[PDB]
Ligand binder design. Structure first.
Ligand SMILES: [Zn+2]
Ligand SMILES: [Zn+2]
Ligand SMILES: [Zn+2]
Ligand SMILES: [Zn+2]
Ligand SMILES: [Zn+2]
Ligand SMILES: [Zn+2]
Ligand SMILES: [Zn+2]
Lengths: 918, 194, 137
């Protein structure tokens, strides 16, 4: 009876607590017997096979956890005679020079033609001149050991339930895919009311407008109204939206993406400065490598806009596609892993521009032998060269390597190489493969080519990037839930959600209903995104993976409806997290390792002194005048003091500091304190004097054109507070529970060679970032010696085995070894050198081997990630280890690391060696 | 620990010929490491003093004071960038010869600066600097360290000619200041042409 | 001490109060003392969103406007009765109202007449720019 067994077990534990306070072996023995009985049942190998294909297993886990808890319980200018200063502490207001202020009056009250009086002084003042535990440790601990041992086969099976990611990718490429329809990939969370965006419906009209309508109706052109501008490198999550007025609006998404859990709150999209384009905007394309760049295309025009951090247009570049007679710009494509390479695709040609070199002349100029261009995608071969793939209107897929031979230096280049694909659905008729071609897309992350035809035939294929041959072909069949729609809709607008491998988006060419596809190594999960009501025809969709308030990289899909409403869908983590599982993700512990102020400033002019508490009594000019006039001052009877608002009207200057003069009229009417940038400064003055306040680099950025100065109340019984002057200065699972319980129990019992060997096996055995943490806790002078010996001996064994079988050490395994060694190189470098003893050389050799396999570009990198997750951190760690050895070939290794063309390698090495010297 | 850091610096300078066309920017970290090691080659200890003198001799062999390729010195080159790195290292070395918060460190720092200046003068480096300066002046007529890292965050030599000019404005100036502080070493002689 | 004679606070009812008199430019004959104003006192006729004109006693004038020679109790800081902005002079106020509030026909009390001694304090005008051009320019 698994149901109820854990609640009864918790009542048993509470009664044990009773006897624990006062009693003799209250529940300790019975609980040992319960562990024995749970082992007896599981030992049923028939039940083990059933689990491989559960209540008793949960009972065992609970008993083990309880047992673990039980075991746990068991010179001066005078030298020469300038910027002079008053020392209030020494009552010199007489003055001191800059040096004397910092030397003879160091830590004194100091306020910014003269002769230092400090030095003038000949006094020499100027220096600038129980039974339960016994039973648990009697035979219970061995009992647990033998239990885990005979259950180890089943335990290894449950553990199974970079290398894995490679295997999964391999399966993805080789194993047949089942197509399943689901409604659980994306779940609706938030939606805006009708009209949130005014004028999003582009009412095309007039000669050019009629042409556009005809082209959209003929499915030759499609409008892309929304684009997300959030590069992985950048942090400016933003949304660009085009409007019927041909105006581009940039919105801030950070507020919207955080209100994901908001039960009943209006969608919030902060508007930024817009973007000016003198044409009807048909497509928006952001640069994934640089989130500031936006390509804006009309029918014949292509503009590249650069946005500042505030969302305003900083730069505007206009391209010249030189379209043929009757030709038009279909779209603009930023070449993968590039910031300047921009391809312009037309029905007649494809021109590729390097915008860093030349915006007028294309670097590449491609033409087809016949037919028209319906889609163009770019792939990077194992060599690293871009290979253009072109879908023709006739249904042929053309491929061409981008090299000097195919360059536009000699004029237009005719692409003749056709990717050969043979399928029963692919029967070319009247020179039209399955009715002709529609769309082509290559996923670098999945290393798969997606393409679709006019007759609703869509395929995913694995291609050899060297030979450009199709290796495996997988059909994507969409079954319309609505009856009578036997004909399959054609697919278009293929895209992958950035930083969410396997989640692919596309749209039916005719219907225009977005589809979300989760690609797994044996299955295509497909969800059709419907509208409630359908009246809100979906105009465009954008998917983005963002950091949630819980730091969860949630994948949000934003839909723009024709009526101007926004609808937001969220990815269901259970159905969309296959490639994001820590088992497939390259989880790495290395990640955890990873007074003269006013002399150089100038008093600002035209600064607006407009404190609201003073605005009611004095006019703006008066305030300025009084604060900048002697004998004149500003007063305020408001209890608690008042706020002065300072506005910098000079956009070329930054406020870096402020000086305030107080006490000239009456000391009792001087403010007691001031608050600026959240800092409270006490004003302890006995005579009229100035107070200096510099602004920190960060505060200088905060006080660029606006500054709020809070003035505290004076000690005047009448409540009068006075300021004499203000000067501004500036410059220009069940398995999880089971393993947790067992390993906690083992660690408590241990609190040794065989125990270490058991943990070592558990370490080698697979884990989804769980058993590892458990084995970590299991492991947590004689002690340090044993511990260090065991870890280093294993590290040496792992490095030797990898060297002998000629196999590159697993990046994660390698990084674990490096961290372990590093920790010891710090705790006991002597132990590090003695136990390991060749070791340093092996580490460094493997580092270079893994570094050489490191992916050239993250976007191009596939689901499996070779190389090292954190080279910098790794380099830092290696330097600590090498240094630890030297304290108790290495120099050559240091020189090699410093020279590495890869900058971070040497720069981090630089930092590591500074720390070792420090 | 001090002795092992010293032998590490020795092996570094021994493989140092390899650093030539590697690129000064890629080698910023290496010369900065050399500095960190030197920040300990102080005291009145003469073993450390001779290690520092051997470093200075390596830097002089690198420096082209003897070479009369003043034109090639004007033309930005790997060698020119390496010479600029050597000058920046020498400046960092002589720039910490102050007496502020120095527990007998002033005595060591002073000795280091004096030795550096003497070695530089013994190689007629001042004459070579005058030559490169006349060359850059002719270039102007034709036209008619970590501090740099902070100032120039891009970490690109940028205007090497300006850096080369600025670096000589510094190295010989430091030489003259040191030859005045240490009377034992004579200050460089400048004639009307200088 | 100079007091706001004939001026009772409409919130706390303390008549002839001292300190800064606060007069509502929307509510007819509505006045607040400094304490009630700072506390954000509201009534059925008055809300905190109503622009208010600060009026000083002579004594306060000499204190607040101390160190600079001015006319006896000469109001020089005016509040826009439409938007509530402050620190306006008879001229800058006119410019502001003409520029930003030219099309507004809401009845308001003239802050200049109210603040200036001898001027009709409860003067009500739908077009404030009219006073700014014919009576208070
Ligand atoms: Zn002085
Ligand atoms: Zn003092
Ligand atoms: Zn002094
Ligand atoms: Zn009152
Ligand atoms: Zn009111
Ligand atoms: Zn107004
Ligand atoms: Zn009036």
């Amino acid at each position: 009876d698994g149901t109820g067994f854990p609640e009864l077990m918790v009542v048993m534990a509470t009664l044990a607590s009773a006897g624990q306070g006062a009693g003799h072996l209250q529940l300790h023995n019975a609980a040992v017997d319960w562990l024995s009985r749970c082992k007896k049942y599981l030992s049923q190998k028939n039940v083990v096979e059933k689990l491989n294909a559960v209540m008793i297993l949960e009972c065992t886990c609970h008993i083990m956890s309880y047992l673990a808890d039980v075991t746990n319980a068991l010179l001066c200018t005078f030298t020469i005679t300038q910027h002079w200063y008053h020392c209030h502490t020494c009552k010199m207001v007489v003055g001191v020079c800059t040096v004397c202020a910092k030397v003879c009056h160091k830590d004194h009250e100091i306020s910014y033609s003269f002769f230092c009086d400090c030095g003038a002084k000949e006094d020499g003042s100027c220096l600038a001149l129980e039974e339960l535990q016994n039973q648990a440790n009697f035979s219970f601990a061995p009992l647990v050991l033998d239990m885990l041992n005979f259950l180890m086969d089943a335990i290894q099976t449950n553990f199974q339930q970079s290398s894995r990611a490679q295997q999964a990718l391999s399966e993805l490429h080789t194993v047949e895919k089942a197509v399943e329809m689901t409604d659980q990939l994306m779940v609706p969370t938030l939606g805006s009311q009708e009209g949130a965006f005014e004028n999003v419906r582009m009412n095309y009209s007039g000669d050019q407008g009629q042409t556009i309508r005809q082209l959209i109706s003929a499915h030759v052109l499609r409008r892309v109204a929304m684009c997300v501008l959030s590069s992985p490198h950048g942090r400016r999550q933003h949304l660009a939206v085009s409007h019927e007025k041909g105006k581009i609006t940039v919105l801030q998404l950070s507020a919207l993406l955080k209100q994901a859990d908001s039960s009943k709150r209006k969608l919030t999209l902060t508007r930024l400065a817009s973007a000016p384009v003198p044409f009807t905007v048909l497509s928006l394309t952001g640069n994934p490598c640089k989130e500031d760049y936006l390509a804006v295309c009309g029918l014949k025009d292509c503009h590249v806009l650069t946005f500042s951090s505030s969302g305003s247009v900083s730069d505007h570049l206009v391209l010249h596609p030189q379209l043929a007679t009757g030709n038009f710009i279909i779209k603009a494509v930023w070449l993968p892993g590039s910031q300047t390479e921009l391809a312009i695709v037309t029905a007649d040609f494809v021109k590729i521009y390097d915008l860093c070199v030349d915006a007028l002349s294309p670097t590449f100029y491609f033409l087809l032998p016949s037919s028209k261009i319906r889609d163009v995608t770019f792939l990077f071969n194992e060599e690293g060269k871009n290979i253009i793939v072109i879908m023709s209107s006739a249904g042929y897929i053309y491929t061409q390597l981008m090299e000097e031979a195919s360059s536009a230096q000699q004029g237009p280049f005719y692409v003749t190489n056709v990717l050969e694909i043979n399928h029963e659905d692919l029967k070319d008729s009247n020179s039209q493969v399955a009715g002709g071609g529609v769309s082509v897309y290559y996923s670098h992350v999945l290393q798969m080519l997606f393409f679709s035809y006019c007759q609703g035939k869509s395929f995913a294929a694995t291609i050899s990037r060297t030979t450009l041959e199709v290796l495996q072909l997988f059909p994507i069949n969409i079954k319309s839930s609505n009856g009578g729609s036997k004909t399959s809709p054609a697919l278009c607008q293929w895209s992958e959600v950035m930083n969410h491998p396997g989640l692919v988006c596309c749209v039916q060419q005719t219907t225009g209903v977005p589809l979300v596809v989760m690609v797994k190594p044996d299955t295509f999960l497909i969800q059709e995104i419907k509208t409630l009501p359908a009246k809100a025809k979906i105009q465009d969709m954008v998917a983005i993976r963002h950091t949630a308030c819980n730091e969860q990289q949630r994948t949000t899909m934003i839909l723009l409806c024709e009526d101007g409403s926004l609808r937001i869908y969220m990815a269901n983590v259970e159905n969309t997290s296959y490639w994001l599982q820590p088992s497939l993700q390259p989880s790495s512990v290395i990640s955890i390792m990873k007074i003269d102020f006013f002399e150089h400033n100038q008093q600002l002019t035209d600064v607006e002194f407009g404190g609201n508490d003073l605005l009611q009594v004095y006019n703006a000019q008066q305030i300025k005048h009084r604060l900048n006039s002697t004998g004149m001052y500003v007063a305020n009877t408001k209890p608690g003091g008042f706020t002065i608002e300072i506005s910098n009207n000079n956009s070329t200057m930054v406020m870096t500091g402020m000086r305030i003069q107080i006490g000239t009229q009456a000391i009792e009417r001087a403010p007691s304190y001031i608050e600026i940038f959240g800092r409270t400064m006490q004003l302890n003055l006995s005579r009229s004097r100035w107070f200096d306040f510099p602004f920190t680099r960060e505060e200088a950025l905060q006080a660029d054109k606006k500054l709020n100065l809070f003035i505290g109340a004076s000690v005047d019984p009448a409540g009068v507070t006075m300021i004499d002057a203000v000067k501004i200065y500036g410059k220009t699972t069940v398995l999880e529970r089971l393993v947790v319980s067992s390993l906690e129990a083992l660690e408590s019992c241990f609190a040794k060679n065989a125990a270490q060997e058991l943990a070592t096996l558990l370490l080698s055995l697979p884990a989804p970032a769980s058993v590892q943490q458990q084995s970590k806790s299991l492991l947590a002078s004689a002690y340090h010696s044993h511990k260090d010996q065991a870890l280093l001996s294993k590290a040496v064994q792992c490095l030797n085995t990898s060297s002998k079988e000629g196999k590159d050490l697993d990046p994660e395994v390698f990084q674990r070894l490096v961290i372990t060694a590093r920790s010891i190189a710090i705790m006991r470098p002597n132990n590090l050198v003695h136990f390991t003893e060749s070791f340093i050389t092996q580490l460094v050799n493997h580092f270079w081997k893994l570094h050489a396999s490191k992916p050239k570009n993250a976007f191009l990198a596939p689901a499996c990630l070779p190389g090292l997750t954190h080279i910098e951190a790794t380099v830092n760690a290696l330097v600590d280890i090498i240094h630890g050895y030297c304290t108790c070939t290495a120099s050559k290794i240091y020189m090699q690391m410093l020279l590495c063309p890869d900058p971070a390698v040497s720069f981090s090495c630089k930092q590591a060696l500074i720390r070792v010297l420090r | 620990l001090h002795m092992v850091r010293l032998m590490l610096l020795e092996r570094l300078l021994q493989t140092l010929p390899q650093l030539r066309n590697v690129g000064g920017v890629r080698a910023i970290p290496y010369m900065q490491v050399i500095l960190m090691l030197t920040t300990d080659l102080d005291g009145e200890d003469e073993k450390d003093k001779g290690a520092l003198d051997n470093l200075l001799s390596q830097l002089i062999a690198e420096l082209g004071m003897d070479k009369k390729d003043v034109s090639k010195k004007n033309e930005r080159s790997a060698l020119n960038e390496v010479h600029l790195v050597v000058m920046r290292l020498l400046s960092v070395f002589m720039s910490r010869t102050k007496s502020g918060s120095k527990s007998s460190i002033c005595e060591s720092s002073s000795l280091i600066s004096s030795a550096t200046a003497a070695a530089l003068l013994s190689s007629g480096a001042v004459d070579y600097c005058l030559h490169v300066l006349k060359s850059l002046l002719e270039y102007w007529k034709s036209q008619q360290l970590r501090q740099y890292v902070k100032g120039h965050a891009a970490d690109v030599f940028e205007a090497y000619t300006q850096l080369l000019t600025e670096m000589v404005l510094r190295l010989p100036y430091q030489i003259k200041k040191i030859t005045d502080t240490n009377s034992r070493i004579p200050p460089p002689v400048f004639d009307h042409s200088w | 001490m100079s007091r706001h004679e004939g001026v009772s606070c409409d919130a706390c009812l303390k008549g002839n109060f001292r300190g800064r008199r606060y007069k509502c430019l929307i509510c007819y004959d509505y006045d607040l003392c400094a304490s009630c104003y700072e506390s954000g006192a509201t009534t059925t006729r008055h809300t905190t969103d109503h622009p208010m004109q600060c009026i000083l006693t002579r004594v306060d004038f000499d204190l607040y406007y101390g160190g600079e020679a001015f006319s006896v109790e000469q109001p020089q800081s005016f509040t826009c009765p439409y938007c509530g902005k402050m620190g306006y002079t008879e001229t800058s106020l006119q410019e502001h109202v003409t520029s930003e509030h030219a099309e507004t026909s809401t009845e308001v009390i003239c802050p200049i007449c109210a603040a200036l001694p001898g001027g009709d304090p409860n003067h009500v005008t739908d077009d404030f720019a009219a006073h700014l051009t014919l009576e208070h320019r």
